[PDB]
Design an enzyme around this catalytic site. Sequence first.
Site, short mmCIF file in Angstrom:
data_model
loop_
_atom_site.label_atom_id
_atom_site.label_comp_id
_atom_site.label_asym_id
_atom_site.label_seq_id
_atom_site.Cartn_x
_atom_site.Cartn_y
_atom_site.Cartn_z
N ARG A 75 -4.75 -7.34 14.50
CA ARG A 75 -4.89 -5.95 14.05
C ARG A 75 -5.75 -4.94 14.81
NH1 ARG A 75 -7.09 -3.25 9.69
NH2 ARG A 75 -5.65 -4.33 8.26
N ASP A 135 -1.41 8.34 -0.96
CA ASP A 135 -2.10 7.51 -1.93
C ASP A 135 -2.51 8.31 -3.14
OD1 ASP A 135 -1.81 5.78 0.16
OD2 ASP A 135 -3.87 5.00 0.03
N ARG A 138 0.67 9.13 -5.22
CA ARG A 138 1.09 8.00 -6.03
C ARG A 138 0.07 7.77 -7.16
NH1 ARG A 138 0.00 3.83 -3.48
NH2 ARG A 138 0.91 4.64 -1.54
N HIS A 162 -8.25 5.60 4.35
CA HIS A 162 -6.89 5.23 3.99
C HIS A 162 -6.69 3.76 4.34
CE1 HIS A 162 -2.61 5.38 3.44
NE2 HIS A 162 -2.41 4.99 4.69
#
Length: 289
Positions: A75, A135, A138, A162
């Site tokens: 990552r 976000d 939602r 985030h």
Amino acid sequence: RSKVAIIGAGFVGASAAFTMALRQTANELVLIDVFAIGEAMDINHGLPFMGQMSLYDYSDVKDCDVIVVTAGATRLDLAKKNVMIAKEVTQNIMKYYNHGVILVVSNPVDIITYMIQKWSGLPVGKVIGSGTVLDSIRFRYLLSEKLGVDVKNVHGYIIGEHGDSQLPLWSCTHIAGKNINEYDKKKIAEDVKTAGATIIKNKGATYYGIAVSINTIVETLLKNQNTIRTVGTVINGMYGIEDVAISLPSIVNSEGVQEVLQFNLTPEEEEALRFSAEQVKKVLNEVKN
């Protein structure tokens, strides 16, 4: 009147375009690529753009109201990988950059948004990341869609990074003026930070939700309606948060951020927010090269 340029014709760049093509959010839209033209033709197949013109090169960032960067691809390597792509894009954009607001969408958005803000050497109020805009959206939705109320009255925000450190601003979440203290809901918060992960598991990617998010934000900017959005901004001097990009409810328009609402957060929330910043700051140290 309006003119938006999307950098990157990937599924995201494409979707985004396609979405603000159906919604005809801008008068002109440019697909700047980095490999593009074909992606524009397929969208132009649904021809009725009675208020939009979809075309295809960075020299077209001229007179753009917004410029979206969707470029980007073990990552932390991703970040460092994307930082390279980003750096190159920033150069080209700035080679012809004139009047405009830059919207970062590339992932890890929190990091790239900050980085890009620097690379460009542009005011901090002009470079913005998509941050936790989706976000928060939602977040309010899940609430309304669970309390028999409609998002219309649901007022809540998702601030911070985030990612996993994000936190919901409960202290400032009200239903028509009713605190969340009705009569538990630590799940709503979860489904908001789990959504991205779960989607990536099945579809193996994500670009519809973001594409929508972009559209939203672009719409917000183009309307200058003083709408509040938890977009990513390089913060410095708030809640004790220094050099680092993070999401916070802020009123934006076609010409940059107007102000990043300084909500009064509880001690736990100020903690949480502060902590969140630290996560992003960790990665930033790795980058900055």
